């Protein structure tokens, strides 16, 4: 029932977590953030990365 990501849809497939504890989204679907395989190390979403 809960939704996530920039697409605001339910969880599905592989999800990646934003490493900014103050992130307003926290979890994203891999494809929505252009990922096929998980990146190494800490990762920050597009919303927290941009100005």
């Amino acid at each position: 029932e809960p939704t996530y990501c920039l697409c605001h849809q339910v969880s599905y497939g592989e999800m990646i977590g934003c490493d900014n504890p103050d992130c307003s989204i926290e979890w994203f679907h891999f494809a929505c953030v252009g990922l096929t395989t998980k990146p190494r190390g800490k990762w920050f979403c597009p919303r927290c990365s941009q100005e």
Binding site: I16, D19, P39
Partner: peptide, 8 residues
């Protein structure tokens, strides 16, 4: 990065 597979 931290990831998780959607549980069924």
């Amino acid at each position: 990065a931290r990831t998780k597979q959607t549980a069924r």
